[PDB]
Design an enzyme around this catalytic site. Structure first.
Site, short mmCIF file in Angstrom:
data_model
loop_
_atom_site.label_atom_id
_atom_site.label_comp_id
_atom_site.label_asym_id
_atom_site.label_seq_id
_atom_site.Cartn_x
_atom_site.Cartn_y
_atom_site.Cartn_z
N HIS G 20 -12.76 1.46 -25.76
CA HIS G 20 -13.74 1.98 -24.81
C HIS G 20 -14.47 0.88 -24.02
CE1 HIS G 20 -17.67 4.27 -23.89
NE2 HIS G 20 -16.74 4.66 -23.04
N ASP G 28 -3.77 -6.40 -5.04
CA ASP G 28 -2.82 -6.53 -3.95
C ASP G 28 -2.15 -7.88 -4.18
OD1 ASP G 28 -5.71 -7.03 -1.92
OD2 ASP G 28 -4.44 -8.64 -2.71
N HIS G 98 -17.01 -7.45 -2.33
CA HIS G 98 -15.78 -8.06 -2.79
C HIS G 98 -16.07 -9.28 -3.67
CE1 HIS G 98 -11.61 -9.28 -2.86
NE2 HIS G 98 -11.93 -10.47 -2.38
N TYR G 120 -8.08 -5.91 0.59
CA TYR G 120 -8.93 -5.25 -0.39
C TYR G 120 -8.34 -4.09 -1.17
CZ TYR G 120 -12.02 -8.01 2.54
OH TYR G 120 -12.58 -9.05 3.25
N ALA G 121 -7.02 -4.04 -1.31
CA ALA G 121 -6.40 -2.96 -2.07
C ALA G 121 -6.41 -3.36 -3.54
CB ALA G 121 -4.98 -2.72 -1.59
N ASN G 122 -7.61 -3.46 -4.10
CA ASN G 122 -7.79 -3.82 -5.50
C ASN G 122 -8.79 -2.88 -6.16
OD1 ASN G 122 -8.09 -6.63 -3.67
ND2 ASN G 122 -6.39 -6.62 -5.12
#
Ligand SMILES: [Cl-]
Ligand SMILES: [Cl-]
Ligand SMILES: [Cl-]
Ligand SMILES: [Cl-]
Lengths: 131, 131, 131, 131, 131, 131, 131, 131, 131, 131
Positions: G20, G28, G98, G120-122
């Protein structure tokens, strides 16, 4: 076989990586080695090799720009203290308290243990540059 | 500090593990070290330390029941050959061809490299027992 | 086989690397060993080997300049407290609280665990120098 | 603290992994340990701990279905030979030449070195099963 | 085979090294394990093994002087909370917030993962001493 | 948390790498584990987990194309032998001598130790393929 | 072969250890991976695999309690930002700068690199619990 | 900095350990390196450094007793073949088939990769001795 | 063989892991390498390879967004300083004191040592992104 | 970021070390990986990435001189078998029985696992040279 340079394989590997300002320590048989610092022990019996002989070999295989020793050496071990002044004439010789000295050894790339059985026979050689 | 025994820290560790029949090698500056065998290099410069100096210290700190050397040592290095005969006058000395000698070094617990610059100055000390 | 020095192979390797001021710990069966400190366990069964036997062997094989123990030993284990004072009559003996004692063990080179089943039967031996 | 089982931490880890037919060795101070076999050294000084004491503790903490020893023990160490025969009266005891015995030690999970200074005081304990 | 003590080989190794005040954690299937802490996972499927089964075996093989649990266990998991109270009726039980509890797991020698699928089913067992 | 698959983290890592024909072993509390083979011990106490329960969980999380057991199981442990025939009805069940069986385990990717205290309760599951 | 769960062996091992609040990162092709954090590179060529395809698979195999992405993703990559919002309808989605997002990646158990070639595809997936 | 010997740190370490008959390989950009053999890649781009430049430097820093090259070098790379013949005028030069040459590289202490983009520009330098 | 990208295998591995803002250092023969930072030594002899040749290959195989160099290079090494300006005319070039420059090398993924024998011939290349 | 070459960091490292005749394997989701061989798993879910997509990227980034596949692929997986023939029309394609094929994977530098769920969808790419 390797034609040039220091004969000791362990020392050759250490000298090979030296960069400007890196430090190595030459020690008597009693100096403690900080955790994490490589120890290369050349001692065979008390007095062999001697501090002077080891320091002499290193002087001709390594470019030294500064020598650091413990102030206590001048009083407790005058013979080896003179040897240093004489050997590293052109180099800057800085003296510190044995305590400060020991703290500085934590940054050394290696400690070379000799068979020297005399007080404060230790020094830090700071690598210079060839150009 | 350790009060008794051999002064060299690397060597003390090796002697500490010796059991009956275990072997260690004392070698000149040119003997090749087999892969997998630990190498302890005590050399400082040509001739320092010498084969004779090293062999004497080891004979004093280790129980040796047998010594092995290359037959070529008698013909090409009489001084050291006689030294071995005298030093280990009470032990059994066996001579093999240098080629066989090298094959035997593969089973050694370690190879101690000296600064000796004379031919076939190598030997295997085979540990004995204290009782 | 090794002719001189401590018989135990693990302990021989530790003593071999000892430099001035390095510390080792002799401990009862309950002392906790800090993370990162080498643990050599000699215990066989309750009381074997005893704190006294172990401390006696080490005192004979190592140069000790100082001994450190927990004040609590004088209260809950007078027998071993006297033994310690007697064995190291020439050395400086300092008593600290058991809490402080445990903190100091974080800097030891090793902890030697004995089979001693009596409270606070622990001590730190600080290495001296042979010259 | 662990409530049951052998007190020695190193030995507990070895016994924990024992499966049917796995072997461990109890050895005198001189037996050589094969490369790759874990060595646990309990020795403190000559005679401590003794072969008998060590073998007794192990017999109490481990299920042994078979004991192996060198025939030479009956000739040069009758005392320990009898002890062994008595201690493991219920188990199968096989005698082999010391040479063969040493060969078999290559398959042991560990060699427990005692402080025993008497000849051929070694034995292999082969683990039995509890069900 | 090992005759006495806990049956699990991974666990026996952990108990073998316990010293006074060392901690181990028994955890439900969801507790996160801090980096650097050894994880021993005994889970097979949801509910197997259970928190209660695991805690009982450990209480039987380890000397516990103190138990630590999350306060949220009383309100969200009464059955197990009462189980702990009963099982360790003679030990000191301390309740911290689950957040503080997790911070404390960083100092544990290991985390034993059970198949328990109920909230806050975790506790820290702090080793006591046998003398 | 991981939504699907076997709950045990150690087992999940092993199943993840299984390829066609890879083998894993489910063992009783006495089977010896060959050197170099990963051992995952789930045992808690005698009989927990049981051979049947462990084998059942693996059967539903792993594609088995063949089961290998020791012939001795049919005589010495008929109850667990039937369980296997019943559980792996569609799979090919091959029987071998317990000795041949043990040799085969040297190729296993892992040995899963259960708390089973009955004779010859061991089997090798050979991974099948999903397409 | 493994019947259930994620197909990728590397990822299966990572998910298996999740507790947990543990975090994993999907990145990216340009996101830097902090030293010490395990990197699992799945990229084949630009656009393969896509951030969306990877995020979708993880969402189906892992219990996600919270999602974290960089605010910048709303400005320079609305397409993937909408995707994220829809895939994790029921979960909490926190947007940070970011720069802060990158600092949080140092605590991640792993960084999964995709072939995504868009800014920014994270995102960070924080593990939830199954009970 | 190191005053004498080869400038490259990686190579200095390799030369330092050379004993009589040890071998090192100088290779073109395509020669495969056997598993287990250390690879030191000096290439920057095609043609940098050249086989000739590299071989010349090694010849000046290492005592070469014998040189080994593939017969094919005389056919497809006369330029480098002549170079080799001239650089090692005093040494023995053995030509073997390229296939045998590759088998011998498995015994090399290291393979030095150059930027040479011409066929069969490889050679084995066998160390000689300085006494 | 690999068809595209940098020829050097060591450097290819480092470029392969670069993410936005990661840094690599190109150094002269004297720059010290911080502990923990990977050193790839391409030097063969003084002036080979040159700083300019190395930087040129890298600029063509790596996307650079920023270059950092010591201010001292403008006055003590004008030639290389001009080269740097011309090669990275598009990118941002920041100048710090040499002491400050060296502190920054602590965070580098690697230091590429060249054979350059001129002062302050070092620079940090900060990785950019391809989208 | 790296400007040229294969995008996958793991694969780039492997291609970087390829020498003439080195081999890499492209496998379906079920091919077992021999012990000692590096496994790079690129699979995400069944059919992703596909065998054809993976082989295509490799053929474009690696110089291949020979392809090896199982004979069974022609009859059990016609589609992929045709693809293989078309993609490597220039190179030599050798067909062995699947059992023989698997033995050959022992010598591979790596096995790239794809998400391909069709039988015998595996092949060995043997590296060629660029000059
Ligand atoms: Cl000693
Ligand atoms: Cl136990
Ligand atoms: Cl899974
Ligand atoms: Cl050198």
């Amino acid at each position: 076989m390797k034609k040039h340079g220091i004969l000791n394989s362990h020392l050759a590997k250490i000298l090979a990586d030296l960069g400007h300002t890196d430090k190595i320590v030459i020690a008597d048989a009693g100096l403690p080695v900080p955790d994490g610092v490589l120890k290369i022990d050349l001692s065979l019996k008390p007095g062999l090799p001697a501090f002077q002989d080891t320091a002499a070999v290193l002087a001709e295989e390594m470019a030294v720009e500064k020598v650091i020793a413990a102030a206590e050496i001048k009083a407790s071990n005058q013979e080896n203290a003179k040897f240093l002044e004489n050997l590293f004439s052109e180099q800057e010789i800085e003296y510190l308290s044995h305590e400060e000295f020991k703290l500085l050894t934590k940054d050394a790339k290696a400690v070379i243990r000799t068979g020297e059985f005399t007080p404060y026979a230790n020094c830090i050689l700071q690598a210079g540059v060839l150009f």
